[PDB]
């Protein structure tokens, strides 16, 4: 099998702990910019499956031995919503392969959730990248001007940065609970337990913990509806800055209503001694109490 | 991809960047004239982010070094690390400068060598088709680094408008005023350019250096040979997410974006604890991560001269706590658990705060893969105490009739002194207004 | 041999009642076999049964791993070759199926566990050997047990003991989350209703049945109660140290002879109890386990250990325990009387005091009533030696 | 947690606290500049109760040392134990003071350096969120320790009202009155502040030092180099329940609470027998605990000059008998059995008395884990003999017209001499009244 080298290769291109590939995914997120306005030809998978293979050499990492294990399948979903023009923010999926000796490691259930994990990073990375694209819009020569006055930039950029405060520290805490203890539990434990027979009964339990640690939402809770509504204002955040100052100040009060809406559901998930993100959410709540 | 061009400039800016490049070869496992170790690609997964990309596996530094004084560059070529530098990117042999000690010297020399100063430093710009930005590794002390450095903060703002600007600038020393007396004039002229003609700075105080240089380092006569040891480590510490493979805020526009509240409020407090070599004999017993960030917010490792009783009415807004190397990440959320119970950071009452922690694996080396390292990038609103210290030393000097007749003979016809005074008070008033 | 109960109609006095307890049966026991012999085959046979669960090389007799079995088989042939029956031949080789079996499990649990490690650690959690390391817990847990108890206060006091033992820097980080704390429904208060759960791993649990950790936990809430009322008398003392908080009235002087009588009590009564309970009862345990290669004789000696600690600390059932909790209640209102701003100059400061100058001599005179039962003596020597030791430390 | 800040002050208070910190490293198994032994955590279970808590396993002392005389601090930095001290917590190099010899000097210097004396000593206060208190390790002899020490007993009483105050103060010598003559004036001015502006004291007589210094120590010329040997051991002996892991009265507010009968009656008699190194060859035969406390109540180890025929009408109220190290605790109740039969302590006829005995394990060291040690903290009502000795030397000096014109030129306008005389007689009358 040489399984530990294949195990490290899955971590680098599905879990994204060598972030050069997911930073290059942000450049692939910098090639969509809203959906749908993309071609619907059959050349649309032909040039788009290529540029992800070309993106690995763009970061100068890995040989072609593991690059055969990565494949990309461009799915088809409507984004103008009557015709098709498929996305690359949530409709571009990495497909890991099943090969000749290594089949007790990878099954069809674990590749189903590899598509779930790859599509879930790709939308939060689209948030953080386009949130920094606005900093490119007002970047210094000067562009946007009025450093404090006239019509607001002083309190304008004050609510915009405390917006980009909260998102940039949520994603860092979600990143720390996905990656670290799971990588500490995985290889070491499995190998040392010299219990190595019928590997997919343990690897799928490891992957089920790896999706337990992300958000897991029982794949049904309204927390997935709030990560969509807070995504629904970041497009509203980026369209007003590309283009309105009164329509601005209403839009982030709606964010502060939705962020306080995101705080009150967490207080309803509360149960006790449970969900290592729940305490990490209650970190900020006891931060919210002292100020 | 993510190529940054460092702008090493001045008498002090060239020496702090000389050992910055010398620090990078010891951690990349490379030699300045050859490649003798294979640890450069298996251990380090990314090397072409500050160096120029290789033509013969020779990672050229993307560096330029201009100074009026030829003494700083004549102590370079006899060292065996200068063959890594190129004698065609910046200057050939026997480069000189002015006489020279004036802020108006380098401010007037920028437009007479205007053709040559925008010719060879732009050849490294089009090497990569996606340029990150420019860091001005310059100085505030003296008239050499402060005179010419204020010119490039203006003409690179519009010729390269979509690039990040952020500097690691060192503050001068305010102990006595005998050898230099022009220190309040050349500092405030560059400090105006650091806020409106520049996005971010990284402050590095000089009076706080000898506070640390006699703390654990145990010297009797303070020399200039110790100023490069505290500075070169935290420079390479700030790019550990950028040089070594990280995931989040792995770019220089990633780290600075999550800490700046607003323009003209960008002065970041720096902290770095581990500087002692006899700690190495007791780190073999699994020294954890639970004790290394309890002392970062405690004002012991700070490099900023600030008031001790002025922290109750001031509030932290953004605090960075960077752990490196061996982290034991099953307890890094445990270290952030203990932050809310002490409330060592005063939080802003108008909005949320953030304690961001990140990690990256260090160099495959024995003093690096054994001892825990903590890099702090704070942002506290007590930084106006330095601005109150510099302004009180500025208006007191203008009432003593000091350098008003000796400074306005060359290229100064109007009084631009209160143009620096009001803009400094604009920074000092908007800081206290920022917590409503 | 195996610990296998080969019965189909359960026709044996051993019946199933990692440990997997087993029980006796009087109707299946022969009365010519002595009655005290029946548990010598049962409890040793129950303990060889519990090694079948986890791992087969961990057996008590030596069954997969040793060759006790061949010697046992030779003994079996000898016993079989006999048409008659007597008592001495049957019971002298009941040694050999016990004694060599009773030493091999003693040589088991030394090396797998570092025996001497947790069996001083579990006593330090219950008898409170690390005395400072729980007072910081008691100081923090006082300020948020100021309600009638609810079911969430169990988890809140738990994470508070977590952060308290964590800022102390224990020498073992993993010794910290080995327990949690437990607490009644809502009587009046959280104190004197809380407890501790220190659960235990593999086969050390046969030395610690789930009965006797309640017997350790019941004095544990009593010993922290006299850490709290000692430290509360240590803090209301700490308010009247200087003249600027001291009034020179005679109402202060009648307040003041009482605490010299009452704060001298808990620094004496709960000291000469608790330190002499620990020292030469810990002394013979360490001397027995270093000098005896045998299992149940070490085991029931630590059963005589625990029953001596819970007898000295119980002194008498109704009166003295009601006299002792009446002591700690009556000096607890000496805390809440002093804790006002400038106490001894208030009319309520002397008005609340006048009830307490009765109740303090309600306690010394009730302590005086036990001393007449200690002199006129047919009750208990360890009761009498301790209570007089504080009494010549009282009346002299 | 239980952090105490020691206030070392004066010419004699700085030297008795210098070897007090030097005693603590030999018993903790640590070096003042490094950690070379592993005996610090396995042998000693608690170290952060007098030291500052560690940042690099360097236990900083929580100490401040101010004195007008620079001679006591210039004999410190050449010793190798001064690198453990910090040159930023108290003073940097070249610290000075007054001229200077006066009680009114340091009493008037407290409000002119009022800004600086309440700035750097308060930085150690907020290090722990639960401060134990303050011990004033000062002197009564001279005008240096008595002049400035009376000021901090007033302003720390209200700025820190919920903290324990208790001092280990040394009494001056009353043999002849040639070199100093201001001894009755500066002593009684501080002795008033020790009763109403201070809760407890620990008396240490000087005429009783040379009674012991020629008893078993066998010296011919009495020098000042022997005054630090009797004092530094009993200081570390008093915190054996506090430093080493004990159970009952393991805090400084535990021990002092069980001995003080009332305010202005807090003068505790001290006793300590084992000071001889040739006793070591015969302690191998199990020297027991049954003989070590028979000589504590016997007036042989006392450090208080008192009358020998005045103990029949005086009564003990509180007596502490601290055994350390090897105790053999199966006979420690046997030692307390023999106390009632002799009645060597006269008991108060109005109330009960108490003989409190406690134990704690000593340092893992061969002179410490072999020889029995007995520390006494008595409280006997014959302590008015010293107060009768000081008052009879006080009113006799005012009739000789001594220092009435030479003392009232600076900051003294009214006669505050009988303000000290009546309050001293209030102490002397309430002591004899206390046994009704």
* DSSP class per residue in C127-168: S-SS-HHHHHHHHHHHTT--SS--TTHHHHHHHHHHHHHHHT
Look up residue C48 and give its DSSP letter: H
CA distances from D429 to C114, D422, D424 (A): 63, 10, 9
| Alpha carbon distance D427, D422 (integer Å) | 9
Ramachandran angles phi, psi of B378, nearest 5°: -85, 170
Strand pairing class (D373-380; D267-272): antiparallel
Q: Measured between CA atoms, how close is B392 to chain A, in angstroms? A: 26
Place of tokens 């001594």: D402
What is the H or E stretch that residue C124 is in? helix C115-126
Cβ burial, residue B249 (10 Å; 0-12/13-18/19+): buried
By residue count, chain B amounts to: 436
**H-type helices in chain A, by residue range?**
3-10, 20-29, 43-46, 48-59, 108-137, 156-185, 187-192, 200-212, 223-242, 245-266, 276-290
| Structure tokens that stand for C24 in this block | 């006796």
> Following DSSP, what letter does each residue of D192-239 receive, concatenated?
HHTTTS-SEEE---STTHHHHHTTTS--SS--GGGTTHHHHHHHHHHT
Which chain B residues are closer than 8 Å to A279 by Cβ? Answer: 337
Of D196, D250, D351, the CB nearest to C132: D250
What is the H or E stretch that residue D65 is in? strand D63-66
Query: Please, which residues have CB within 8 angstroms of residue B102's CB and are 6 or more apart in sequence?
Result: B143, B147, B182, B410
| Structure tokens that stand for B183 in this block | 């220190």
Query: Please, which residues have CB within 8 angstroms of residue B311's CB and are 6 or more apart in sequence?
Result: B299, B346, B380, B382
Please report the residues numbered 54 through 113 in chain A whose beta carbons come closer than 8 angstroms to any beta carbon of chain B: 58-61
Rg (CA), chain A: 21
Rg (CA), chain D: 22
| Residue D167 preceded by cis peptide, ω within 30 | no
> Following DSSP, what letter does each residue of A175-237 receive, concatenated?
HHHHHHHHHHHSHHHHHHTT--SSTHHHHHHHHHHHHHTT--GGGTSTHHHHHHHHHHHHHHH
Are residues D192 and D419 in contact, defined by beta-carbon separation less than 8 angstroms?
Answer: yes
| Alpha carbon distance B354, C60 (integer Å) | 58
Are residues B17 and B65 in contact, defined by beta-carbon separation less than 8 angstroms?
Answer: yes
| Alpha carbon distance B411, B426 (integer Å) | 27
What is the H or E stretch that residue C36 is in? none
Which of helix, strand or coil describes residue D4? strand
| Structure tokens that stand for D327 in this block | 């105790």
| Alpha carbon distance A216, A135 (integer Å) | 32
Helices C106-113 & C115-126 angle (0-180, nearest 10): 80
Give the number of other CB atoms < 10 A from CB of residue B312.
Answer: 8
Look up residue D122 and give its DSSP letter: S
Residues of C with CB under 8 A from a CB of B: 163, 166, 173
Strand pairing class (B373-380; B267-272): antiparallel
Query: Nearest residue on chain B to D129, judged by CA atoms?
Result: B342
Cβ burial, residue A74 (10 Å; 0-12/13-18/19+): middle
Of C136, C241, C389, the CB nearest to D333: C389
Ramachandran angles phi, psi of B97, nearest 5°: -175, -140
Cβ burial, residue B248 (10 Å; 0-12/13-18/19+): buried
Query: Nearest residue on chain B to D128, judged by CA atoms?
Result: B342
Q: Shortest CA distance to A152 belongs to which of A252, A20, A39?
A: A252
Query: Nearest residue on chain B to D87, judged by CA atoms?
Result: B215
Cβ contact, residue pair C173, B338, below 8 Å:
no
Are residues D289 and D327 in contact, defined by beta-carbon separation less than 8 angstroms?
Answer: yes
| Alpha carbon distance A287, A281 (integer Å) | 10
Place of tokens 């110790």: B226
The distance of Cα B68 from the centroid of its chain, to the nearest Å, equals 21
3-state SS string for D278-298:
HHHHHHHHCCCCCCCCCCCCC
B127 annotated ligand binder? no
Cβ burial, residue B247 (10 Å; 0-12/13-18/19+): buried
| Alpha carbon distance B185, B103 (integer Å) | 8
| Structure tokens that stand for C298 in this block | 């070490």
Strand pairing class (A92-96; A70-74): antiparallel
> Following DSSP, what letter does each residue of D381-392 receive, concatenated?
TTTHHHHHHHHH
C-contacting chains (≥3 CB pairs under 8 Å): A, B, D
Strand partners, A84: A78
Cβ contact, residue pair A154, B253, below 8 Å:
no
Are residues B192 and B166 in contact, defined by beta-carbon separation less than 8 angstroms?
Answer: no
Are residues D417 and D398 in contact, defined by beta-carbon separation less than 8 angstroms?
Answer: yes
Are residues A131 and A125 in contact, defined by beta-carbon separation less than 8 angstroms?
Answer: no
Which of helix, strand or coil describes residue D275? coil
| Alpha carbon distance A177, A279 (integer Å) | 12
Give the number of other CB atoms < 10 A from CB of residue D343.
Answer: 10
Strand pairing class (D267-272; A70-74): unpaired
Q: Shortest CA distance to B118 belongs to which of B66, B47, B187?
A: B66
| Alpha carbon distance D18, D25 (integer Å) | 12
Helices A108-137 & A156-185 angle (0-180, nearest 10): 150
| Structure tokens that stand for B408 in this block | 């306005």
Chains D and A share 3 or more Cβ pairs within 8 Å:
no
| Alpha carbon distance D55, C107 (integer Å) | 43
Which of helix, strand or coil describes residue D326? coil
Residue D18: CA count within 13 A, CB half-sphere? 23
Strand pairing class (D200-202; B267-272): unpaired
| Alpha carbon distance D395, B244 (integer Å) | 81
Residue A230: CA count within 13 A, CB half-sphere? 26
Strand partners, B376: B271, B321
Are residues C258 and C356 in contact, defined by beta-carbon separation less than 8 angstroms?
Answer: yes
| Alpha carbon distance D191, D146 (integer Å) | 9
| Alpha carbon distance C12, C24 (integer Å) | 9
B144 annotated ligand binder? yes
| Structure tokens that stand for D141 in this block | 């002899």
Cβ contact, residue pair B332, A180, below 8 Å:
yes
Strand partners, B134: B5, B165
| Alpha carbon distance D412, B364 (integer Å) | 72
Which of helix, strand or coil describes residue A254? helix
CA distances from B118 to B90, C315, D90 (A): 12, 94, 54
Place of tokens 């026997």: B94
Rg (CA), chain C: 28
Are residues A24 and A53 in contact, defined by beta-carbon separation less than 8 angstroms?
Answer: no
Are residues D38 and D167 in contact, defined by beta-carbon separation less than 8 angstroms?
Answer: no
User: Quick check: A273 contacting C, CB < 8 Å?
Assistant: yes
Strand pairing class (A92-96; B3-9): unpaired
Resolution in A: 4.8
Strand partners, D200: D166
**H-type helices in C247-346, by residue range?**
250-266, 269-289, 296-312, 319-330, 332-338
CA distances from D133 to A109, B174, C239, D198, D253 (A): 64, 38, 13, 12, 9
CA end-to-end distance (rounded Å), chain C: 64
Are residues A158 and B261 in contact, defined by beta-carbon separation less than 8 angstroms?
Answer: yes
| Structure tokens that stand for B99 in this block | 């006489």
Which chain C residues are closer than 8 Å to B341 by Cβ? Answer: 163
Which chain A residues are closer than 8 Å to B250 by Cβ? Answer: 19-20, 23
| Residue A56 preceded by cis peptide, ω within 30 | no
Strand partners, D7: D64
Nearest-5° Cα angle at D244, D242 to D250: 30
Which of helix, strand or coil describes residue C16? strand
Of B1, B264, B348, the CB nearest to A291: B348
The distance of Cα A13 from the centroid of its chain, to the nearest Å, equals 13
Q: Shortest CA distance to B264 belongs to which of A168, A131, A164, A158?
A: A158
Which chain D residues are closer than 8 Å to B290 by Cβ? Answer: none
| Alpha carbon distance C16, A208 (integer Å) | 40
C198 phi-psi bin (left φ>0, alpha ψ -120 to 50, beta other): beta
Which of helix, strand or coil describes residue A73? strand
| Alpha carbon distance C308, C277 (integer Å) | 8
Give the number of other CB atoms < 10 A from CB of residue C119.
Answer: 17
Give the number of other CB atoms < 10 A from CB of residue B347.
Answer: 20
D-contacting chains (≥3 CB pairs under 8 Å): B, C
B147 annotated ligand binder? yes
User: Dmax of chain B from CA atoms?
Assistant: 67
| Structure tokens that stand for B172 in this block | 């001068």
Look up residue D403 and give its DSSP letter: S
3-state SS string for chain B:
CCEEEEEEECCCHHHHHHHHHHHHHHHHCCCCCCCCCCHHHHCCCCCCCCECCCCCCCCCECEEEECCCCHHHHCCCCCCCCCCCCCCCCCCCCCCCCCCCCHHHHHHHCCCCHHHHCCCCCCCCCCCCCEEEEECCCECCCCHHHHHHHHHHHHHHHHCCCCEEEEECECCCCCCCCCCCCHHHHHHHHHHHCCCCCCEEECCCCCCHHHHHCCCCCCCCCCHHHCCHHHHHHHHHHCHHHHCCCCCCCCHHHHHHHCCCECCECEEEEEECCCCHHHHHHHHHCCCCCCCCCCCCCCCCECCCCCCCCCCCCCEEEEEEEEECCCCCCCHHHHHHCHHHHCCCCECCCCCCEEEEEEECCCCCCCCCCCCEEEEEEEECCCHHHHHHHHHHHHHHHCCCCCCCCCCCCCCCCCCHHHHHHHHHHHHHHHHHCCC
Q: Shortest CA distance to A242 belongs to which of A157, A138, A118?
A: A138
């Amino acid at each position: 099998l040489k399984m530990e080298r294949h195990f490290e290769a899955m971590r680098h291109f599905l879990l994204m702990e060598d972030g050069e590939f997911a930073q290059s995914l942000s450049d692939m997120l910098f090639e969509k910019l809203g959906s749908g306005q993309t071609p619907s030809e059959l050349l649309n998978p032909l040039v788009l499956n290529s540029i992800l293979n070309k993106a690995l050499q763009y970061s100068l990492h890995g040989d072609s031995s593991l690059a055969s294990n990565l494949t990309f399948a461009l799915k088809y979903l409507p984004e103008v919503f009557t015709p098709t023009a498929p996305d690359a923010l949530s409709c571009l999926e990495l497909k890991y392969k099943v090969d000749w000796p290594l089949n007790i490691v990878i099954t069809d259930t674990c590749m189903n959730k590899y598509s779930r994990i790859f599509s879930f990073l790709l939308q939060l990375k689209h948030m953080v990248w386009t949130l920094r694209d606005v900093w490119f819009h007002l970047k210094r020569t000067a562009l946007v001007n009025q450093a404090s006055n006239s019509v607001q930039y002083r309190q304008l950029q004050l609510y915009r940065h405390e917006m980009q405060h909260f998102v940039k520290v949520i994603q860092g805490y979600i990143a720390n609970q996905i990656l670290h203890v799971t990588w500490c539990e995985f290889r070491n434990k499995l190998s040392a337990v010299s219990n190595l027979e019928e590997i997919y009964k343990t690897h799928a339990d490891y992957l089920n913990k790896a999706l337990f640690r992300g958000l897991l939402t029982e794949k049904a809770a309204p927390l997935m509806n709030i990560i969509h509504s807070i995504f629904s204002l970041i497009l509203k955040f980026r369209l007003q800055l590309i283009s309105n100052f009164g329509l601005m100040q209403q839009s982030y009060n709606t964010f502060k209503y939705y962020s306080d809406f995101l705080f009150e559901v967490v207080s309803k998930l509360v149960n006790r001694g449970y969900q290592p993100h729940l305490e990490d959410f209650l970190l900020r709540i006891n931060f919210n109490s002292y100020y | 991809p993510r190529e940054i061009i460092t702008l090493q400039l001045g008498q002090c800016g060239n020496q702090i960047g000389f050992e910055f490049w010398k620090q990078l070869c010891a951690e990349h496992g490379i030699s300045p004239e050859g490649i003798v170790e294979e640890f450069a690609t298996e251990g380090t997964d990314r090397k072409d982010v500050f160096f120029y990309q290789a033509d013969d596996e020779h990672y050229i530094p993307r560096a330029v070094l201009l100074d009026l004084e030829p003494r700083v560059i004549h102590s370079i070529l006899n060292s065996p690390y200068a063959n890594l530098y190129n004698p065609e990117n910046i200057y050939l042999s026997e480069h000189g400068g002015g006489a020279g000690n004036n802020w108006a010297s380098g401010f007037s020399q920028g437009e007479k060598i205007h053709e040559d100063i925008f010719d060879i430093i732009d050849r490294e710009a089009d090497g990569s088709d996606s340029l990150e930005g420019f860091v001005l590794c310059h100085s505030i002390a003296g008239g050499t680094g402060s005179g010419l450095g204020s010119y490039l903060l203006e003409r690179l703002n519009d010729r390269y408008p979509k690039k990040l600007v952020q500097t690691y600038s060192v503050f001068p020393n305010q102990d006595e005023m005998s050898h230099v007396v022009v220190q309040p004039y050349n500092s405030l002229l560059t400090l105006k350019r650091l806020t409106q003609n520049a996005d971010c700075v990284v402050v590095l105080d000089n009076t706080a250096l000898n506070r640390i240089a006699t703390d654990r380092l145990h010297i009797q006569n303070p020399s200039f040979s110790q100023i490069n040891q505290l500075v070169s480590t935290i420079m390479s510490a700030s790019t550990t997410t950028l040089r070594y493979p990280g995931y989040m805020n792995n770019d220089l526009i990633g780290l600075i974006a999550s800490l700046i509240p607003t323009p003209r409020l960008h002065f970041l407090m720096t902290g770095y604890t581990p500087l002692t070599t006899d700690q190495s004999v007791a780190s073999v017993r699994k020294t954890t991560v639970l004790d290394v960030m309890r002392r970062l917010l405690q004002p012991k490792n700070v490099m900023v001269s600030t008031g001790r009783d002025r922290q109750t009415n001031h509030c932290y807004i953004a605090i960075l706590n960077i752990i490196q190397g061996e982290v034991d990440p099953t307890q890094v959320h445990k270290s952030l658990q203990r932050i809310r119970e002490r409330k060592l950071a005063n939080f802003i009452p108008w909005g949320p705060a953030s304690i961001q922690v990140a990690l990256s694996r260090k160099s495959p080396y024995l003093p690096s893969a054994h001892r825990v390292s903590g890099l702090m990038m704070a942002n506290h609103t007590n930084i106006s105490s330095l601005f109150e210290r510099t302004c009180r030393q500025y208006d007191k000097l203008r009432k003593r009739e000091a350098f008003l007749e000796q400074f306005r003979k060359e290229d100064i016809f109007k009084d631009n002194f209160d143009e620096l005074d009001n803009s400094r008070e604009i920074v000092q008033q908007l800081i206290d207004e920022y917590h409503a | 041999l195996h610990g296998l109960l080969l019965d189909q109609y359960e026709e044996f006095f051993v019946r199933q009642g990692s440990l997997k307890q087993f029980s006796l049966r009087a109707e299946m026991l022969p009365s010519y076999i002595p009655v005290r012999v029946a548990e010598k085959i049962l409890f040793v046979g129950e303990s060889v049964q519990m090694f079948e669960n986890q791992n087969v090389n961990m057996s008590r007799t030596g069954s997969i791993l040793k060759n006790q079995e061949d010697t046992f088989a030779a003994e079996l042939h000898r016993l079989k070759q006999q048409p008659l029956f007597s008592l001495v031949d049957f019971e002298s080789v009941l040694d050999r199926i016990r004694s060599t079996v009773a030493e091999h499990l003693w040589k088991l649990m030394v090396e797998e566990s570092d025996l001497l490690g947790q069996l001083k650690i579990i006593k330090d959690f219950y008898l409170l050997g690390r005395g400072e390391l729980f007072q910081a817990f008691i100081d923090v847990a006082q300020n948020m047990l100021k309600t009638p108890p609810t079911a969430v206060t169990e988890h809140d006091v738990n994470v508070a003991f977590q952060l308290s033992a964590h800022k102390v820097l224990l020498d073992d980080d993993n010794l910290l989350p080995l327990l949690n704390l437990t607490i009644r429904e809502a009587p009046t208060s959280g104190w004197a209703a809380l407890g501790l759960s220190y659960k235990v791993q593999w086969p050390l649990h046969i030395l610690f049945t789930p009965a006797v950790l309640e017997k350790y936990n019941v004095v544990f809430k009593y010993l922290l109660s006299v850490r709290r009322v000692q430290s509360e008398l240590q803090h209301c003392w700490a308010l009247q140290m200087q003249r600027k908080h001291l009034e020179s009235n005679k109402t202060d002087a009648i307040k003041w002879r009482l605490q010299n009588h009452m704060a001298f009590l808990v620094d004496n009564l709960q000291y000469y109890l608790q330190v002499d309970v620990l020292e030469s009862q810990f002394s013979q345990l360490l001397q027995q386990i270093n000098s005896t290669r045998d299992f149940e004789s070490i085991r029931l000696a630590h059963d005589h250990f625990l029953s001596n600690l819970l007898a000295q600390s119980f002194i008498l059932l109704k009166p003295v325990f009601h006299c002792l909790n009446e002591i700690l209640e009556l000096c607890h209102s000496f805390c809440s009387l002093v804790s006002q701003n400038l106490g001894p100059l208030d009319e309520r400061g002397a008005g609340q005091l006048d009830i307490l100058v009765k109740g303090f001599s309600c306690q010394s005179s009730l302590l005086f009533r036990i001393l007449s039962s200690v002199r006129n003596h047919q009750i208990n020597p360890d009761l009498a030696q301790l209570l007089l030791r504080l009494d010549y430390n009282k009346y002299y």
